[PDB]
Amino acid sequence: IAVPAEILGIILPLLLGVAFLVLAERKVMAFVQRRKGPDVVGSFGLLQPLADGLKLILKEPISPSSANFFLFRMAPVATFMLSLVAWAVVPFDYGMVLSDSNIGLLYLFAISSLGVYGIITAGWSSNSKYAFLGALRSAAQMVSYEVSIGLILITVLICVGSCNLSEIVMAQKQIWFGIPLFPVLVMFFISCLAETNRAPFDLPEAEAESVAGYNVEYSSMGFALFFLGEYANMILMSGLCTSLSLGGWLPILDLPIFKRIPGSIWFSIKVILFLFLYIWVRAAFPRYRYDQLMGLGWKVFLPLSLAWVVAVSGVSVTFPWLP
Amino acid sequence: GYLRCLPDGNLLQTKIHNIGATLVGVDKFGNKYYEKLGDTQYGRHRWVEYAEKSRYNASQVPPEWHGWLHFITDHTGDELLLLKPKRYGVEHKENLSGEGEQYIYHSKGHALNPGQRDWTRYQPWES
Amino acid sequence: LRWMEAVLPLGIIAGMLCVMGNAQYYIHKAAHGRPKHIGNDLWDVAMERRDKKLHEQAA
Amino acid sequence: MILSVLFSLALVSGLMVVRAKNPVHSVLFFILVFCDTSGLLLLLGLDFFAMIFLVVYIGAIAVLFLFVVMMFHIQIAEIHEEVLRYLPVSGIIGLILWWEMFFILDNETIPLLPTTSLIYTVYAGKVRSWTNLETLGNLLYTYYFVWFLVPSLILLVAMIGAIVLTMHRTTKVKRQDVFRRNAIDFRRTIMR
Amino acid sequence: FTLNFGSLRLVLEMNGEVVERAEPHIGLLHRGTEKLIEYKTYLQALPYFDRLDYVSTMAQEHAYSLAVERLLNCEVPLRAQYIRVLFCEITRILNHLLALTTHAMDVGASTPFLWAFEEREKLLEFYERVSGARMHASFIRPGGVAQDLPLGLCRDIDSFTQQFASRIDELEEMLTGNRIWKQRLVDIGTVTAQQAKDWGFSGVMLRGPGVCWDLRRAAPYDVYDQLDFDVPVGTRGDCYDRYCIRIEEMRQSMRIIWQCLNKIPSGMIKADDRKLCPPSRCRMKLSMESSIHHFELYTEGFSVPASSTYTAVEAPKGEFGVFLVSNGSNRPYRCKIRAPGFAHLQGLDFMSKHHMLADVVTIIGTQDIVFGEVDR
Amino acid sequence: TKLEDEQREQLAKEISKDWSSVFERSINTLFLTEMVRGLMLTLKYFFETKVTINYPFEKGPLSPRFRGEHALRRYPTGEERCIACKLCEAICPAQAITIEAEEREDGSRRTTRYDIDMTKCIYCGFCQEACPVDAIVEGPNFEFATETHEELLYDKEKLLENGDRWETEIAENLRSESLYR
Amino acid sequence: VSKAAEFVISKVDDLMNWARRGSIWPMTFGLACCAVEMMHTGAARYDLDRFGIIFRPSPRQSDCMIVAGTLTNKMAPALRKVYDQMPEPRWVISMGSCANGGGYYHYSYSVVRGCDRIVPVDIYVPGCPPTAEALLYGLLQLQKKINRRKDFLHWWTK
Amino acid sequence: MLEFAPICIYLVISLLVSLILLGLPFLFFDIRFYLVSILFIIFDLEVTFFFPWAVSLNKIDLFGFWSMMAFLLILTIGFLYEWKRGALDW
Ligand code: SF4
Ligand code: SF4
Ligand code: SF4
């Protein structure tokens, strides 16, 4: 019926957006670094993702024969499932949701919790022990920063009585929650940066460095699926950031000239600014050591998140400012 | 050649750069040499359009325009053509190097050479 | 305009988000004849079922 | 039908947990049976409890088990025993427990034999439908705060025990210090 | 447990992610440079020094030419000395830029790499205009230089110096003062001055501890004793202070470049005597003796008196020394090549002790091991 | 480590002179001032013009004293410029040049065999400066990548045709550099 | 074998060659002193990311190995081992003179007389060091060489 | 519920597309990890308790708010124990 059509219309444009997102990351990083990104495969490099995908498809696969063939193959499948089903709930405007779950926030938190298993199984199923150690490190980092992310979600849930993203936005109608909670938004942005192993806290992508990663053993399509899952998670958490601290499909100042824009355009624009911030932070800053980032996650963001939860609860309970 | 811009993207950059340029010359192979001074950075004020949009090659620039294009000389290719030597000389040929065994260069001892020469430095008795 | 050429791939991502959202919205609208409701609950489900039965009885 | 499929998958995953040769496979099938139980909770209507099962059981406890199992690197023939010998005793005990289930079901909970048209809808409690999450929070934080504060003591005990059992600070290893003078002020110096 | 990494091969003994010890295997770039130098004439052996420590090209040429002139006792004109100093400081700037940006990339900072490569491309354009190629330009020869400066080079270098002061300010603003950069560098691979002296460190790795000793001031081998530059030292030798020392050395190299441009004299570019320096093309095509001497200098070489010496210069990596032993013939009997990477890579073992893997790679970047010079 | 501890205490006392300074330091460390400044510089370079060369159509600057492809020239009359003096391989540090010769039919000294390995040439210009007649020159061409090592193994005929092809640019560079000699 | 099936096969081969040409993912084998010039090629001026070239540190994901620098007898087994892990569609670019025929250390112990003795190299880039211009020329030559791969036609006519 | 059926169909379609993507080419010890996991368990339980509290702040009074604060204080003392013992360091 219409549900498979909606699911396909969510999934395929998401893959196109991920491809153009890696292309945009290349272009923005190059323009930052006083150079030009992919410009020779199509006009302005618009066909570069297509060429890359076709090359990856046409590349002949190799079988590691690691005695864990099923677990080796299914881990990128698992993370791809997790990214897609996480994207299954995010709203885009008033009524553009597949599952209008009343517990949408906790659903996304649970899906983020499940995300470590793909990397853990990928590291274990690989023959090399370096990949296993890197997978363990990445899993632990995602664990700590997801604890921080959950505390930020609790702050937002204190601000808004409901638990579904659509009603969250409907409450965001007034002040966007970013004006009241800009430090909370900053902490959530850094936590989601460390959640997807992007920007600083980039352990798996430091392959030229001694940490190596969990994708060393993986073949063409395994690596491609892991990359697609990571970038889909990046877009997902940018959407989470804009739905939580920027009002989602809501204009600025509620002027009637701004209401001519559908609102899905507003959500897309905010997601684009968040992705630009992702690439900006990745290009502009060095990376943390594993111990440094773990101590920072467990000692800097967790106490601050707890303190902000307490402060928001105290502000809301004391005054009649409660929903 | 403007339809090649959509699947090329590099010819697109060249056409974007030929907005305010002045056509300083053209060679006998069709390559059109452009110069653009003013508010332009140093490294991108001279260039060429190879007039072969499908398979343009970096070795298609003749020696007469090679120096001017590479910023060795202020002399355009016309002056070097005027100064081209007589009584000897060959026409410019691209770096094929893979377009065919009959096109590539072969040593005198290579089996692919049309005439292969033996190398022993002695003449046998040859009854 | 170079910044515009560099942001052009981002515009494709924004367009993809808009396309997925709007295609979902219009497929659901065509399937049910009304835009999807986000505040629905047991009461809303019961009322919609009663409305469907009443209208199919009247027609 | 969906319920039958769900607990058939759950039973198969549990059997694989019981009889799995590799403890990593045991953890994975444990994750699978937790997912099936979460689906059963969706069927029941406890969305919050299903999500928290995912978050805690699937996330926390299961990554703990996975980490410890993989880090052990348990080999075969180190944990290996023939299952045929214990089959009679397992069957007898399972049959006794199943017979007791039979006796429990035969008296208290009688299944209904074939309904929808006889459903009387009150419409009075549906004006403001309280979610499971909302009701649980209201109760647990207003009128049952003691049974909520006690698990905090349990978690504190667990943390204290985990530290006092699995803590080993390095006796002689240098630790980087960022509060040095060259990092703080860094007065420039020259050879002259 | 032993963890292996595979032209940098390194085996590390680890206990708790803490590096107990690190052992490098270096021979992967051994090429028989000393044997080939022994088998070839001095002029034919200059390109070998071009290839050694390839990030800093003309420093090795300067060291080799100084050793040959010491064994040969030939006076180099003031203009040749000044242009040699200018290009040695350009070489120092190039090497420091590359070392800093490769270290930043190894840490994780990717963007300053390409800015410093734009600067390096400008400097390599300077090299290509003054000499044959962008890299491995055999420009510095015993008795002087290969050729005179092309006209306009001084003006272009002045423009580069201004824009490069701006660029160094730019890079220091981005890297210095960053919390992540500080956490990566400070208190990482610290070396005491006694440890540095014991392990034979030189250059930045020796001035980082604060020994307060520089070769250009201890043994001035050029107009250096007329250039009144500054030599930075580190209060507490570590990666951060070595990085700051490298920044200050870039600034002082710009200072020396400006001074050389300002006070460069007008004269000849090589030694006056044609027995040791080849005559010009016009002279060899016009004069019988000049033709004889060109022919003899390009078939045979200058026969240095039989002696052994060690000549060391302040290469950007550190003290680069050449030990030349002759026997009166046209070929060097023995040529030992002391590079300031061989000692630093020994220092890696105790520097990266009780540290972690990222600290090991940071220490490698700070020491700036070019494997060509360590595998000389 | 007691010295380190007391140094840390002294430094902490030094940089905590007053509440204004401690508050300023805490706010700077909390609000990511250095990170914001780095982001601003990064944005400035994102919005500034680029220095990409656009390779195939725009090529990097060179010099007349460029060491590209070895080549052999001729006199304006048409005769080979190369006498068989064998100063090429006497000075070639890599020994990439092999030359054999004999007296020609009219008594002229010419090379009957002259080959250069482009896989052994280090592109150093020793031969082009050791030539008494300016016969061998390292031409300005450098885009001569070949698919086969045997192709990269040159000989006299290929060197002569390279010189004939690039004679005008080589002559211009030779004039400009003979000024610098 | 027909004239319309041949046209369809030619179009498919053109698409495959376009994809493989525009998505080259070379891996650096950066020994000695062609690697610095390679980093200059990868810099802002002669940028490689425009044409699709991005350096993959893992040999399993790389397309073509670019061997730049001197090959030593101590390192040739490592080069061969790393080459053997590359996927079947693979190419080799030998940059410089050391990796072509031994270069300036041809008559030397513990120096492999060109990488051709260890791995089958497709394109040589002469120079010492070859200009970044010349190395990018060699990469464009690799694109041209893989622009005439009739893999589908060869598979069809077997 | 009635809203998780689209989630199940989405999961099935995601499986299908992942399998298709895989099959396209075929056509042609350490205690620190354990401590981190234990902290994960504790703070997952913390957040699980926060969720209903945060949702139902409007119904629960200062009694509920202070009960949650006491819960945090009991568990924040454990966090101070973690910090001072050295469990948060690596
Ligand atoms: S340029 Fe140097 S290496 Fe090349 S042939 Fe001439 S002397 Fe030999
Ligand atoms: S130096 Fe000149 S004349 Fe002598 S052999 Fe070489 S090219 Fe011929
Ligand atoms: S070919 Fe020349 S530039 Fe390249 S590694 Fe060898 S000596 Fe260095």
Side-chain angles (χ1 to χ4, degrees), chain D residues 42 45 47-48 60 64 71-72 130 133-134 137-138 141-142 145 148-149 152 155-156 159 163 166-168, chain H residues 1 4 29 31-32 34-35 37 41 44-45 49 52-53 55-56 59-60 64 67-68 71 74 81-82:
Chain D
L42 277 296
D47 43 4
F48 173 73
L64 174 66
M71 281 195 318
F72 280 170
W130 277 29
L133 199 157
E134 174 167 0
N138 171 27
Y141 292 109
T142 61
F145 72 106
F148 162 67
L149 290 169
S152 71
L155 295 190
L156 174 83
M159 271 185 318
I163 293 317
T166 66
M167 205 55 228
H168 274 92
Chain H
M1 321 295 318
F4 280 78
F29 47 94
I31 54 175
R32 274 309 187 283
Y34 175 77
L35 297 174
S37 183
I41 300 191
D44 287 331
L45 286 158
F49 279 121
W53 173 75
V55 161
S56 68
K59 294 182 301 283
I60 78 173
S67 169
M68 192 46 188
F71 172 90
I74 291 182
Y81 180 94
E82 301 305 19

Side-chain angles (χ1 to χ4, degrees), chain A residues 157-177:
Chain A
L157 200 76
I158 292 173
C159 278
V160 64
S162 67
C163 204
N164 51 329
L165 298 172
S166 303
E167 184 75 30
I168 284 182
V169 165
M170 294 329 267
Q172 303 254 20
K173 184 152 211 173
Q174 184 93 355
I175 206 56
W176 270 22
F177 285 0

Side-chain angles (χ1 to χ4, degrees), chain A residues 280-319:
Chain A
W280 199 359
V281 172
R282 168 199 176 72
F285 297 144
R287 94 166 55 78
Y288 268 122
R289 200 161 63 232
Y290 174 60
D291 60 344
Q292 275 155 20
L293 62 83
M294 281 295 268
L296 192 151
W298 273 119
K299 297 162 83 103
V300 171
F301 289 154
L302 175 74
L304 272 173
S305 305
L306 264 177
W308 271 101
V309 163
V310 175
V312 171
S313 66
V315 171
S316 277
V317 170
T318 299
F319 299 99

Side-chain angles (χ1 to χ4, degrees), chain F residues 70 92-94 96-97 116 121-127 138:
Chain F
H70 288 270
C92 186
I97 298 173
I116 303 188
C121 172
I122 79 182
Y123 305 89
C124 78
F126 276 6
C127 54
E138 196 144 11

Side-chain angles (χ1 to χ4, degrees), chain E residues 31 47 51 54 135-136, chain F residues 119 121-123, chain G residues 31-35 37 68-70 95-100 102-105 125 127-130:
Chain E
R31 297 171 292 188
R51 269 71 185 169
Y54 38 82
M135 293 177 70
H136 306 333
Chain F
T119 71
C121 172
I122 79 182
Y123 305 89
Chain G
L31 282 72
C33 59
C34 283
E37 183 66 26
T70 311
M95 176 180 182
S97 292
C98 293
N100 285 349
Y104 193 50
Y105 313 88
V125 182
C128 177

Side-chain angles (χ1 to χ4, degrees), chain E residues 71-249:
Chain E
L71 286 186
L72 199 59
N73 184 24
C74 65
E75 155 189 332
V76 166
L78 260 185
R79 176 168 183 86
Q81 285 175 35
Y82 268 105
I83 61 181
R84 283 210 286 197
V85 173
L86 164 64
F87 279 95
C88 279
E89 301 292 342
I90 279 177
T91 300
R92 177 173 313 270
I93 279 176
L94 279 162
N95 189 178
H96 280 149
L97 277 173
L98 183 62
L100 289 189
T101 57
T102 60
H103 184 197
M105 191 155 48
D106 291 331
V107 163
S110 301
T111 175
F113 202 56
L114 303 184
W115 312 342
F117 277 175
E118 187 45 47
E119 313 320 296
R120 282 184 48 84
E121 286 267 26
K122 289 169 197 164
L123 290 160
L124 291 194
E125 203 282 302
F126 284 150
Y127 275 0
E128 183 178 1
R129 178 148 75 243
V130 75
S131 50
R134 315 191 321 131
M135 293 177 70
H136 306 333
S138 308
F139 188 53
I140 284 175
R141 273 86 170 280
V145 301
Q147 288 149 280
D148 197 297
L149 307 180
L151 280 73
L153 198 55
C154 282
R155 197 196 328 276
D156 301 333
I157 296 172
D158 175 63
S159 305
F160 163 78
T161 47
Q162 312 165 302
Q163 77 95 25
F164 188 46
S166 167
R167 300 293 85 64
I168 288 154
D169 215 2
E170 262 172 28
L171 166 63
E172 187 173 343
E173 188 268 340
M174 206 168 182
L175 275 190
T176 306
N178 208 343
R179 54 188 63 186
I180 309 184
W181 191 242
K182 281 179 186 174
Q183 265 191 286
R184 299 287 289 165
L185 291 198
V186 302
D187 207 326
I188 290 301
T190 180
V191 285
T192 70
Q194 182 68 77
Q195 272 172 342
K197 267 153 210 182
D198 267 357
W199 290 91
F201 289 175
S202 66
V204 171
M205 294 274 317
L206 186 79
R207 272 170 287 160
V211 309
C212 187
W213 180 78
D214 191 9
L215 263 181
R216 302 167 283 169
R217 288 260 161 272
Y221 49 85
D222 267 328
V223 303
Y224 291 166
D225 63 358
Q226 326 184 15
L227 297 166
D228 53 46
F229 58 94
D230 280 347
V231 174
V233 301
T235 62
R236 44 201 321 161
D238 53 357
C239 282
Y240 191 70
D241 286 331
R242 293 188 212 100
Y243 157 78
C244 297
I245 284 178
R246 294 192 146 86
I247 290 288
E248 264 297 322
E249 290 275 37

Side-chain angles (χ1 to χ4, degrees), chain A residues 7-60:
Chain A
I7 285 152
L8 284 182
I10 290 190
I11 287 180
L12 308 182
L14 179 57
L15 300 197
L16 270 296
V18 161
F20 279 90
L21 163 68
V22 66
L23 166 67
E25 156 173 15
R26 293 180 181 177
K27 283 295 261 174
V28 169
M29 261 195 68
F31 273 61
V32 161
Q33 285 151 358
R34 274 160 71 62
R35 51 162 177 115
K36 307 178 66 53
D39 279 19
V40 194
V41 186
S43 278
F44 309 123
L46 293 187
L47 300 174
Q48 179 70 63
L50 171 53
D52 281 318
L54 210 45
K55 194 270 294 184
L56 266 294
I57 289 316
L58 295 162
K59 180 169 290 309
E60 281 156 50

